[PDB]
Design a protein around this ligand. Structure first.
Ligand SMILES: NC(=O)[C@H]1CC=CN([C@@H]2O[C@H](COP(=O)(O)OP(=O)(O)OC[C@H]3O[C@@H](n4cnc5c(N)ncnc54)[C@H](O)[C@@H]3O)[C@@H](O)[C@H]2O)C1
Ligand SMILES: *C[C@@H]1CN(C(=O)CCCCC)c2cc(O)c3ccccc3c21
Ligand SMILES: [Yb+3]
Ligand SMILES: [Yb+3]
Ligand SMILES: [Yb+3]
Ligand SMILES: [Yb+3]
Ligand SMILES: [Yb+3]
Ligand SMILES: [Yb+3]
Lengths: 494, 494, 494, 494
């Protein structure tokens, strides 16, 4: 069941959030924010730039100082604060879900039941870790007492994208804060609004000032100032491969800050003849079309064994043909728009490449409507490995389906990409499930399912799909700095 | 006790080591290798360059392929292989120690009793981990079985320096191999020889071909080809901040490979009035002069509380004045040369800056001898925080001593550097030992000792002194890639 | 600040709690419950016996069955349920604290500010673990996939004592439930009431029926039926050494169930001449007198170095002489009664042994008041190691102080006991703090403090003070059963 | 390939081993040791009793004292010592294997290729852990530094059985010693000889005296003195349920020492219609007949789905009919004797119960030969759940095969036993493999294999099959005692 906001959303928070107060931009400049389903302005927002990032970094540094309230509070109280934020987000769930849908072009049903839930669940997960982050005592050679501290790193700059604005903000802040760090978050220029509202809830929960700062703004302005900043200790980023490379170079040129990246993919599924066919069709379908194709882990190469390939394709087309396009707020609407003009153009251009390069068009294949950055859900069959639609992350509702006969051949083809975020394997054979999943060069491999992401599991890429892991026990590693303390003693005993 | 080689060292291995065979350089070119204590050529060595690195990467990739002997062997057998290599290195300890001393300008006493021991101990430590690297089973939300694999990453390029050629080679290969990776090692152009001999012992132990490849050569040639290579998954590096930055940028520009760095420091000691004074003098002394100052963790800023500062300085000068310079092979010689002309020039130039900038010269202060890159052991007192000798890693036998009265002031001064590899605290106060060590922004902090490094402890920098950690349990994290496998099931139970 | 219940406590829950419903005893029998400060009946409570325990075990077994709601729910939802229970306990904190004080003879100030807080903090701690309990994937020899499950054990019987009725109930259920077990709790015959109220809050939070069952009753009746029961998988117990031994034998005779025990102690402090004297006096004082001496970790042997021994004793007597005895509900009252007649008799009898055996009486030494099981706070100096008051856990407000000159001698004396729950070390010497704490045969050692117990730390005894550990990461180990699953595969890869 | 001892085994070590020296029994008494294949005396051995155990405990206590060589040596050197012992055992492998075969009635092929290998592999595994056992640093509430030490426990008494005398000795000592404990081992009265030889190799490796003591002798004499001893901190035991219960009661009555038990089982296999039939037959066959049925994890209930049940039975009988009985030293001999008269009688008596109770005799069913405790390999089909051969651990070469139609029914039947050491599941269905293995109440579950035991995996029972786990990472937990140290500090920082 699914409830709605009984009143019309009114936008309130549109300023830069530093030391728990609302600032105008140093420049006085502001920037517009649109609804992608209508192409209308929703409001203006203060535009942050290097000067404003330099302010937020100073605030974050200050909040991190030895002796400060964020450093001296019990770790269990950092956990409490996060737990409270989660309760507050749950309180304003209608709201947040509506603003997410409206600003992000995200179906309200998903915004409410999935994104909002994932934020809340992820925060509570991270809250639980806070007083469970532990170092070691170590039986070193010689007469010494050695222990390690898993300290927070320091000031972490976090640049996040427009496809899951709330989920991504919580993926970034939840771990960073649980570990004791301070943060300067730069949301996507497209979608600053849910993050500014969450800033209001950070202040209301009671986080010390300067622990979380949020600086709306553009990428090459505000984002670049984060990646090149001499007093930011770590940057985390989700988005394009292009920018991931810039961020990394910038970090090398500046202060050798720590860098973690998540950068999308061209994730493959391998469907064996023995697979439960309908389950495979369903998961691969939802796997590529979710949020209009705008998932890093979109199942954008589906390799099906020859003998079921035609049945797979036909069932996939039947399912793709059942969508209702329109405004993500209206019940029964099952596909929203793409986020903006740039993505719209890229998607249409890649669809054209597919027609031109000889792929078989099964359905969709062009735009839709008079306003909104809508794209008809599109299926291509008989796709081959050198076509643009097989190589490049599309990030639109465009499904590629391809055949294989040889199992060693298809694993090489699945692995033959600089991407490596995720993969899917559909089979009833125990041995093949284990061996295939071992052999795939991907950070997450699903067996007989797809797109299952949980707070308890580390998530990240092999190869150019990123470095590091987020969430799970393992993800917390990227938000600590280990210090070894070795103390001379007269005589050690085991 | 200390034994020696009964015969004169004869050099045998001077070629590139790829797929367990000895190759000449693609170019035919060779490069000379010197003894730093005499400035004489010891031999020529094949000079590897991009072409040769492209060969070694192909070999490493091949050895890493699914189904290969290195991927399918039991993890306990990877451990055995490392254990055997350690026994072989122990067998050829006289030898190795002699070649290390002769090529590296390292006192034979240290080469034998410390470096060689650290290599052997470190290898056995790493051998033990091999079948103890484990993933997780994870109680994810929903009806799924989720587990993680901590796989090896893949082909790791490892560029190492000239100050601890053997120890560094083992620090790099020991973990990488224990975790299951393959490697392409580029030793320092100055000191390839002990590494080629170890390659002979890798072949003799039985490592599959292509698991370890060693490509002697220069930095901007062979080293750069590693850092920019499109099929190397990870690079590890110890050396200069300058190159660390290049390596990182290169990795960003190329294939976003994983990068870990160790980059030296300007490590501080803080000596409180209550410290056991003689213990502090001794450890800080050995801490800065070890291996002619050529330690990443050299104790190159010693802050002493005013009331014991003069006694500290006088005792430090008395100890510095007791060295015998000369050839590192001769018993009773207690200081060898610096590695090469570049380091010699840098050290003399920094000493001059100290005289010029007003520091107080207590002893030494210029070169020594008719041949060899020798520098008299030098002590400067009344040094201040803006002088070059207080800011820049010297990497020579040059000790800085400075005073403090204010404890909060001295921690800010100790932290006021882009470095952060290590620090030392000397006090009898329990509270101060814990609070000071917590407040110092350094990767290792010693209390009432200095320079204690063990295989069981993670080791690495805060800030520009590096990223990542080596050794200990924690260090193994940087040589694995985590994959999450999530399997759909009918019904889960706790 | 300290608030109170605005209305007079009315007792409501007095029945056996099985499958979330309230049962009368099979026998029809009931038993009285007293206030120890007045010796008046507070109510009658259903008296559970073997028959009633057999009912609760059947219910717990049923709730544990594969496919049941408690086994299939997400681990994160077990965490939620515990978190909710913690919020409910916080809601009824006035209440609970009042009933704890009234039934338990516990100062209301402590009941409210310490016990109630510890319950809430401990529950939230345990809630956080629930979805963070993880098994392993293991690189076994041969072509196998091996993983482990850290399953709940099953039905856990938990017998708890009268000194910290609420804290102990939460220490027991929090971990057991977080790990996924079901429980049959037998509270102390003296103090069933706060636990029955918590049962009401378990039902209200939404725990599936049969997950927590609470059977008030006597030790040799209901407690013995738990320890000898053929379908209880684990028993946990806090209380007397005598019963700990019976429980263990019973477990051996019956079904070899798992057993963990916490059994008090005769915990020593060692105060060195260099110790901060006032801090030592204060912590050792509060350490032995807390809750009328009725702490398992009471600091009931204080060894002070000769040269400060007289000053220590005098300051200790000054502090002991400042208590106000009376009803634990009245503000400014700083010592309540002992729990019951048995403890009262034991304490007076041991005090008499101290007078008789030649100890020096500094203050107190007999009973107090016309009603209530009150004992004057008593200090004995010049106590020696063979006197009853040095050997036997008193569990009353009776402080022993003794001298030492020899440090090796005093560690042997501190260790010379079959107990080993905890110890205290007071010194400013870093080396002595580490070496002494290493050498003491005790489960928790405090340095320069005493009595610091936190949810994040494992807690339990060496030697006859118990087996196993509670709380911390480590404590969760005792509430899981590890299963190894080993799956044959065609070919493994690292 | 399989080598043999070129000379006739001569027995040398036959005395009690305390403080690395050979002692006669206090009583002067000696006891005989037999070969089970001939019923001839091999030698006499000193008979240890309470007095001798009291000697070994004093020696172990002494070697454990703070300041002793075993407590102060580096953990890495404990690892070295174990590694050396493993090399020595490998050196004397011919030997040891021959004595194991001759004394134990174990096929020499298995003794050499399996037992001896498992000992060596297990020791090297445990050697690797020694300096990797680590405590924690813990972010406790309040201004404290808290860390934990995972100390050795102390003196561990280890009573081991006659079926795997060498493997069991190494399973016990390897972990105990790696963790830093001292031990008093009581081998089986039947099979002391390989353990005394290993004692000689312990002395030769260089273990400090008193670290390992070995006291041959009887169960109710020497074994009971261990279990009831007031200065033994822990007992570990593998053998009968009967004695496991006595040991536990004894531990409760005496000093509440820690107890771990492994106690055999009645382990079930479940073979589904879709299973690879020949693989299932093979593994279940070897699974019950290994070492003449004398495995704790013998697959002694095989449930086969009706539709393949007859084919399963026929193939199982064909395989059972191919054994050659005789002397375990002669090549091509594939079944040795049972260990002694007691086991021989029990096995024949249980076989008779099977005939009498209506089971179907497929082959074997009585004794063999003129000397030796030989039993013909016996197969029973149509066995039902209430027959003695379905309920009681036989520990002889007697295979039970039974049918099922209902999958929920067969899991209840498999679980319907107080045992729970291990189980086997044979299926090609992924879902069933996971769900069945989850639902089985057994410590190890194999899928599509059986009897796979490795040093890297924890091993132990659910229910009356034991408590605790041996080996793996997890097994080390049972050989440490955790101490929490909590230090007061002026101000903590994260
Ligand atoms: N222990 C420590 O941290 C220290 C140890 C040594 C010096 N440390 C510091 O650096 C200074 C310069 O020494 P150099 O000797 O010039 O080091 P380089 O960093 O260049 O180090 C040489 C190693 O890097 C390879 N290299 C060079 N250029 C390269 C390139 N463009 N791409 C890839 N690789 C390149 C090179 O071939 C060799 O293998 C010293 O004075 C120390 O302060 C700290
Ligand atoms: C170079 C650094 C210093 N060092 C010492 O052993 C110091 C001895 C003097 C004590 C005050 C040392 C040892 C090992 O093993 C290293 C390994 C790797 C890098 C640096 C060192 C050092
Ligand atoms: Yb289906
Ligand atoms: Yb000294
Ligand atoms: Yb010169
Ligand atoms: Yb004080
Ligand atoms: Yb087969
Ligand atoms: Yb006979």
């Amino acid at each position: 069941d699914l409830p709605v906001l009984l009143t019309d959303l009114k936008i309130q928070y549109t300023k830069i959030f530093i030391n728990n107060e609302w600032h105008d931009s140093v420049s006085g400049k502001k920037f517009p924010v649109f609804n992608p389903a209508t192409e209308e302005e929703l409001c203006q927002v203060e535009e942050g730039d290097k000067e404003d990032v330099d302010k937020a970094v100073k605030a974050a540094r200050q909040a991190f100082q030895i002796g400060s309230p964020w450093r001296t509070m019990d770790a269990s109280e950092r956990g409490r604060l996060l737990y409270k934020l989660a309760d507050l987000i749950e309180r304003d769930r209608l709201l947040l879900a509506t603003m997410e849908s409206m600003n992000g072009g995200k179906l309200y049903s998903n915004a409410y039941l999935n994104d909002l839930a994932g934020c809340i669940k992820t925060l509570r997960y991270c809250a639980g870790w806070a007083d469970k982050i532990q170092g070691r005592t170590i039986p070193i050679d010689g007469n010494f007492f050695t222990y390690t501290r898993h300290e927070p790193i320091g000031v972490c700059g976090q640049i996040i994208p427009w496809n899951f604005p709330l989920v991504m903000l919580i993926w970034k802040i939840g771990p960073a804060l649980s570990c004791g760090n301070t943060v300067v978050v730069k949301p996507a220029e497209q979608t600053p609004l849910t993050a500014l509202h969450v800033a209001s809830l950070i202040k209301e929960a009671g986080f010390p000032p300067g622990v979380v700062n949020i600086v709306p703004g553009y990428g090459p302005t505000a984002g670049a100032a984060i990646s090149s900043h001499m007093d930011i200790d770590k940057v985390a980023f989700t988005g394009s491969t292009e920018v991931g490379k810039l961020i990394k170079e910038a970090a090398g040129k500046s202060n050798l800050k720590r860098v973690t990246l998540e950068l999308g993919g061209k994730s493959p599924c391998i469907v064996l003849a023995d697979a439960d066919l309908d389950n495979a069709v369903e998961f691969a379908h939802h796997g590529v079309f979710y949020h209009q194709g705008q998932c890093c882990i979109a199942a954008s190469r589906i390799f099906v064994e020859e003998s079921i390939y035609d049945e797979f394709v036909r069932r996939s087309v039947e399912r793709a043909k059942k969508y209702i396009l329109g405004n993500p707020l209206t019940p029964g609407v099952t596909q929203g728009p793409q986020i903006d003009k740039e993505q719209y153009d890229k998607i249409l251009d890649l669809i054209e490449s597919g027609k031109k390069e000889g792929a078989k068009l099964e359905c969709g294949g062009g735009p839709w409507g008079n306003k909104g950055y809508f794209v008809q859900p599109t299926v291509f069959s008989n796709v081959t490995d050198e076509m643009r639609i097989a190589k490049e992350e599309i990030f639109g509702p465009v499904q590629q389906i391809m055949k294989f006969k040889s199992l060693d051949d298809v694993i090489k083809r699945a692995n033959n990409t600089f991407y490596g975020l995720s993969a899917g394997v559909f089979t009833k054979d125990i041995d093949k499930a284990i061996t295939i999943s071992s052999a795939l060069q991907a950070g997450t491999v699903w067996v007989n399912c797809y797109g299952v992401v949980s707070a308890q599991c580390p998530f990240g890429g092999f190869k150019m799909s990123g470095n590091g892991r987020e969430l799970g026990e393992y993800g917390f590693h990227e938000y600590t700095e280990v210090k070894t303390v070795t103390v001379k003693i007269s005589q050690k005993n085991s």
